[PDB]
Amino acid sequence: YRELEAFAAFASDLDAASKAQLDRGARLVELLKQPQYSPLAVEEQVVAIF
Amino acid sequence: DLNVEIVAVERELWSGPATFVFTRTTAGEIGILPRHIPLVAQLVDDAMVRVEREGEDDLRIAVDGGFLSVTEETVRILVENAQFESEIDADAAKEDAASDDERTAAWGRARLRALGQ
Amino acid sequence: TLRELRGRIRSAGSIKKITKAQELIATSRIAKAQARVEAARPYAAEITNMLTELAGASALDHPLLVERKQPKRAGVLVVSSDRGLCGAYNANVLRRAEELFSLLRDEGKDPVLYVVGRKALGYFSFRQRTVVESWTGFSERPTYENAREIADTLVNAFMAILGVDELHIVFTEFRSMLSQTAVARRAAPMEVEYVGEYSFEPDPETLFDALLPRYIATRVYAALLEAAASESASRRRAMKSATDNADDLIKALTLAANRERQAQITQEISEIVGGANAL
Amino acid sequence: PAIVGDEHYRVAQEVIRILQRYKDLQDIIAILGIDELSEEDKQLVNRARRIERFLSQNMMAAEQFTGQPGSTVPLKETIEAFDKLTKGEFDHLPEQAFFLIGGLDDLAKKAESL
């Protein structure tokens, strides 16, 4: 994703599969985003990544 | 009344109101007043157009291979290259009228027939 | 090494300035080309309207409207820029063109090349595919004269000399400033579309015959204008990308120059204090 | 060539030439991109990237990291594969089909996969 993010900003258009990968990565990155002083037990980490 | 829209392939040249419009279509000379029946006619190679409107002087247009569409409200003239009389270089028209190329000669003749020549 | 890094920084700064200027000029020219497309639209609409009327009063048997019995050859009009710095633009066109060829090859019709633009001309000159005719110098600012010449040549080839049994135009449609897509359109033989529910002089058949070439010329003109607008948009995007890359290169080279400067200062101090500590 | 043979040496030198030209063009690649190169250089770069990625290999020791098992490519197959690469016989496959691939047969497998 983080290579596709840079590629997309300048490509006129992208394949539907590439757009699907972009939309999946834009959600994975937000998923890994986490606030301070709020650790998650592995029990919640596995579900969140799932 | 009529509103004459002389529109070229690149741009619209004229869209003012008019009372009468005259031009030499491939079927002969035609004059159009308001409420004329819808019509489509190909202008001749050297066709010129003359527009008569309220007050202003007659407007003469050199038209290169245009088409004339009389419609319920607008008489639209679609042109490849259209030149008003004020934009004509008369000497250039005179020189081009004798050109060997048929299309260039026809365009020169259209410019002259507008120039009043 | 620091001298090389300073020179590289100066180079990247100059290139950043040039690409930024090109980006702004390309924005202005996007505006100009899109305004020209808008200006050309009404004539296209009206000629299409009168063509529909003539067809409604025509036999629809003109050669431009009927499929050759056995299509053995097809023309392809690739519209391309005549100057670079447009990023993927030309490639996006050219790739699509080859895609079309793969279709034409699969359908048994060998494509015959007509190219507009210097870049596509070089593209095909390196792959040794022969272009019958090429026009150049008006992709940045096309005029109806060029479009009429292109359309007349294409239509004469279609009517025919070996000639072609079909012709396509490959060009970059500008849908929005963000999107610019290469598409291929078959511009002859045209397909009659019955959409469902006037006089003519001297007859609608002769007017139809005189107007179909004019309609094809108008559509080629619209395609060229669309390609020019798309070229300017791609140039703006490519120059913005180049400016960002030049800025990032300037930042990286400035970090490298600072590291080299500190390293040289430390090395000089090391030599000086090694000499003192010996004396 | 007196030691490894001229078939090996010629392929190795061609690969090094392609990669050196790619390194030389790196500046234009960085600022403008592949698009503004000459057609000869554009083709050279498009196959230089593929040669560069094909030199990657799924090493045995990598199994603990990637999970993939490792592969071994005999010297003859390496020479043939890189000879084909330098001649342009694989310029149509996507570039990612060369990551960590280790062989012509497995390259065809991954090309089918994508």
List strands and helices in order, with pairings.
This is part of a larger assembly, with chains A (50 residues), B (117 residues), C (279 residues) and D (114 residues).
Chain A: H1 4-8, H2 16-32, H3 42-49
Chain B: E1 2-8, E2 12-14, E3 17-18, E4 20-25, E5 28-32, E6 39-42, E7 48-52, E8 59-63, E9 67-70, E10 74-79, E11 82-84, H1 90-96, H2 102-115
Parallel strand pairs in B: 1-10
Antiparallel strand pairs in B: 1-2, 1-3, 4-5, 4-7, 6-9, 7-8, 8-11, 9-10
Chain C: H1 2-56, E1 73-79, H2 89-106, E2 110-116, H3 118-126, E3 131-135, H4 144-159, E4 167-176, E5 179-188, E6 199-201, H5 204-276
Parallel strand pairs in C: 1-2, 1-4, 2-3
Antiparallel strand pairs in C: 4-5
Helix pairs in contact in C: 1-5, 4-5
Structural notes for this entry:
It is classed as translocase/inhibitor. The entry lists the keywords ATP synthase, TRANSLOCASE-INHIBITOR complex. Cryo-EM structure of SQ31f-bound Mycobacterium smegmatis ATP synthase rotational state 3. This is part of a larger assembly, with chains A (50 residues), B (117 residues), C (279 residues) and D (114 residues). Chain A is built from three helices and no strands. Chain A has helices at 4-8, 16-32, 42-49. Chain C is an alpha/beta fold and 279 residues long. Chain C has one domain (21-237): ATP synthase, F1 complex, gamma subunit (Pyruvate Kinase, Chain: A, domain 1, 3-Layer(aba) Sandwich). Chain C is 61% helix and 15% strand. Chain C contains five helices and six strands; from the N terminus they run H-E-H-E-H-E-H-E-E-E-H. In chain C, helix 2 (89-106) links the parallel strand 1 (73-79) and strand 2 (110-116). The longest helix of chain C has 73 residues, at 204-276. The radius of gyration of chain D is 15 Å and the shape is globular. Chain D has one domain: Bovine Mitochondrial F1-ATPase, ATP Synthase Beta Chain, Chain D, domain3 (Orthogonal Bundle), CATH 1.10.1140.10. Chain D is mostly helical and 114 residues long. At the B-C interface, strand 6 of B face helix 1, strand 6 and helix 5 of C.
